[PDB]
Amino acid sequence: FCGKGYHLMSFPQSAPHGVVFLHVTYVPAQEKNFTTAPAICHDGKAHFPREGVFVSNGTHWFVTQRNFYEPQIITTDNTFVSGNCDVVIGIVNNTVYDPLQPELDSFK
Amino acid sequence: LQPELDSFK
Amino acid sequence: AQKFNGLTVLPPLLTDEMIAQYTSALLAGTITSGWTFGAGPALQIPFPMQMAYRFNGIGVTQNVLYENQKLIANQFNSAIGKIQDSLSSTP
Ligand SMILES: *[C@@H]1O[C@H](CO)[C@@H](O[C@@H]2O[C@H](CO)[C@@H](O)[C@H](O)[C@H]2NC(C)=O)[C@H](O)[C@H]1NC(C)=O
Ligand SMILES: *[C@@H]1O[C@H](CO)[C@@H](O[C@@H]2O[C@H](CO)[C@@H](O)[C@H](O)[C@H]2NC(C)=O)[C@H](O)[C@H]1NC(C)=O
Numbered sequence: 621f622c623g624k625g626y627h628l629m630s631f632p633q634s635a636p637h638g639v640v641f642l643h644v645t646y647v648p649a650q651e652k653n654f655t656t657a658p659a660i661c662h663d664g665k666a667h668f669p670r671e672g673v674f675v676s677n678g679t680h681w682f683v684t685q686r687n688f689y690e691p692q693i694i695t696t697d698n699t700f701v702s703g704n705c706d707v708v709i710g711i712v713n714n715t716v717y718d719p720l721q722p723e724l725d726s727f728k
Numbered sequence: 729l730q731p732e733l734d735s736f737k
Numbered sequence: 738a739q740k741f742n743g744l745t746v747l748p749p750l751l752t753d754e755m756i757a758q759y760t761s762a763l764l765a766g767t768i769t770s771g772w773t774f775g776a777g778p779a780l781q782i783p784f785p786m787q788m789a790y791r792f793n794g795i796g797v798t799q800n801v802l803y804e805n806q807k808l809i810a811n812q813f814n815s816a817i818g819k820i821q822d823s824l825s826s827t828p
């Protein structure tokens with residue numbers, strides 16, 4: 621409706637009996653393919669990320685956002701839990717990292 | 729946070 | 738639909754075959770691209786991944802789909818299957 625793609629905002633300009641529009645528009649470029657999965661099994665429960673998916677760059681399983689290849693480590697703060705490992709299809713085995721246990725154990 | 733603080737460490 | 742007394746019918750400049758091909762291209766792009774073909778270059782997203790996004794777009798999580806995949810597929814195929822009987826039995 622504004623531009624061709626993902627609109628951001630617009631510039632209005634004048635004509636003698638009309639109007640002309642300018643539309644800054646987000647278009648993706650330089651796309652790559654990866655291996656995706658809907659869920660990750662760890663300790664007998666199904667894990668799902670906060671606002672992304674599970675991706676892997678061939679070996680190591682990552683959490684990235686939808687519109688960019690910005691990977692992150694699978695941790696318990698960007699990933700919530702629902703259900704068990706059985707009822708969901710597409711789930712493979714990996715680990716979800718704990719950001720509290722080294723600070724609990726090796727220091728205090 | 730309290731069960732792993734108490735029962736494990 | 739007659740041709741007499743100075744009135745003359747003109748044929749369509751784009752006939753029905755390329756109209757069917759444009760609608761087929763629309764359905765193919767939306768079955769194997771998501772919304773990405775409607776914005777820029779088409780991107781490869783699976784259809785249960787896309788329907789999980791559209792469930793996430795409507796405000797429910799993934800576990801109403803991935804725990805209910807065969808049920809959603811049964812409801813979807815039964816829902817599209819009664820489209821033909823609704824149009825064929827209603828003039
Ligand atoms: C996939 O991503 C991983 C994680 O970044 C890459 O592994 C790194 O490889 C470099 C070079 O060997 C090492 O110095 C790093 O220590 C590795 N990271 C970790 C966390 O161990 C890997 O290279 C990427 N590509 C492939 C093909 O697996
Ligand atoms: C993911 O990991 C679990 C945990 O090890 C696997 O479950 C085991 O599968 C083997 C193969 O039949 C059994 O012998 C074990 O008894 C299972 N463990 C338990 C605790 O039941 C599971 O198979 C793995 N999934 C995949 C796809 O590799």
Ligand SMILES: *[C@@H]1O[C@H](CO)[C@@H](O)[C@H](O)[C@H]1NC(C)=O
Nearest residue numbers: 652653654655656676677678
């Ligand atoms: C990306 O696609 C190529 C073929 O087009 C395939 O060989 C490769 O395995 C894919 N990448 C991943 C991570 O699966």
Ligand SMILES: *[C@@H]1O[C@H](CO)[C@@H](O)[C@H](O)[C@H]1NC(C)=O
Nearest residue numbers: 657658708709710711712785
């Ligand atoms: C995806 O398709 C392949 C067939 O190439 C099949 O072996 C695999 O089980 C499928 N994965 C799921 C989660 O259904």
